Design a protein around this ligand. Structure first.
Ligand SMILES: Nc1nc2c(ncn2[C@@H]2O[C@H](COP(=O)(O)OP(=O)(O)NP(=O)(O)O)[C@@H](O)[C@H]2O)c(=O)[nH]1
Ligand SMILES: [Mg+2]
Lengths: 92, 173
């Protein structure tokens, strides 16, 4: 249906585990129920993901499984997305 | 493979660094309070007909940063030095930011723009246009007044800064 999610903003761009981050972009979901995937640094953050608008999702980062700060959003309407920015997971 | 211009937003707290960024990035403006630590934005934009990518590092206003600023500043190619026309204090603070930037980049001619934000609040102006202009000329940089609310000159400051970074990359390559 719609186009793939594209994350173009991350606030903040780094932080300790369980930091609350605001994700900005395009096609992040046509609604609250449209969101079916949210991985940051390989970590599944879907459970804490709160859809705000098609350009905004808020969630909490978790301990990394990857070393790349990739922000992958997946919607039912547009499929798996990509990000232009990365998140840096910090250690306490 | 596209050109990538790295812009950095600097200035005191509450002057509108984020508002300017979010209006430019997502065409929005909301009267909200949300102090920044460090946020990253990057998207495709068309500069003078050519598709490029702009990257924006939106930073914290609080001067609680010293060695942290150095790293951020070093990664940037151009800077938007923002202050609010309604807060003289933020204007006087620009001298410091300028100093810190020139230092790390070791370049007095680094792409730079002095931005007087919140132009829509003329009734609360504390910094005169004349004063702001004089400082900009002293530093040899352009001065532009903006409004993240009405979006006046917002696109202009980002485009002009990119053109400077662009020109700069022409000379060095
Ligand atoms: N009327 C008006 N309000 C503005 C303008 N720019 C920012 N504001 C308001 O001023 C407040 C602070 O803006 P904000 O972007 O958070 O400032 P900042 O410089 O990013 N803050 P910090 O340094 O703490 O990260 C917000 O409530 C915002 O809506 C403007 O041009 N006009
Ligand atoms: Mg901010």
């Amino acid at each position: 249906s719609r186009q793939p999610p594209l994350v173009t903003g991350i606030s903040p761009n780094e932080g300790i585990p369980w930091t609350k981050v605001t994700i900005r972009g395009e096609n992040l979901g046509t609604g609250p129920t449209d969101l079916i995937g949210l991985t940051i640094c390989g970590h599944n953050c879907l459970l804490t993901a709160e859809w705000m608008s098609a350009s905004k999702i808020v969630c909490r980062v978790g301990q990394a499984k990857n070393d790349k700060g990739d922000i992958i959003v997946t919607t039912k309407s547009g499929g798996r997305g990509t990000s232009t920015v990365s998140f840096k997971l910090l250690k306490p | 493979s596209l050109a990538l211009h790295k812009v950095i937003m600097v200035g005191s707290g509450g002057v509108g660094k984020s508002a300017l960024t979010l209006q430019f990035m997502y065409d929005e403006f909301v009267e909200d309070y949300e102090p920044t630590k460090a946020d990253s934005y990057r998207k495709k934009v068309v500069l003078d007909g050519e598709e490029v990518q702009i990257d924006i590092l939106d930073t914290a206003g609080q001067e609680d940063y010293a060695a942290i600023r150095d790293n951020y500043f070093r990664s940037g190619e151009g800077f938007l030095c923002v202050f609010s026309i309604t807060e003289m204090e933020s204007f006087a603070a620009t001298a410091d930011f300028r100093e810190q930037i020139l230092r790390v980049k070791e370049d007095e001619n680094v792409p730079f723009l002095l931005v007087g934000n919140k132009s829509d609040l003329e009734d609360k102006r504390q910094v005169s246009v004349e004063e702001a202009k004089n400082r900009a000329e002293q530093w040899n940089v352009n001065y532009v007044e903006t409004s993240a609310k009405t979006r006046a000159n917002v696109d202009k400051v980002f485009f002009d800064l990119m053109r400077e970074i662009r020109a700069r990359k022409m000379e060095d390559s």
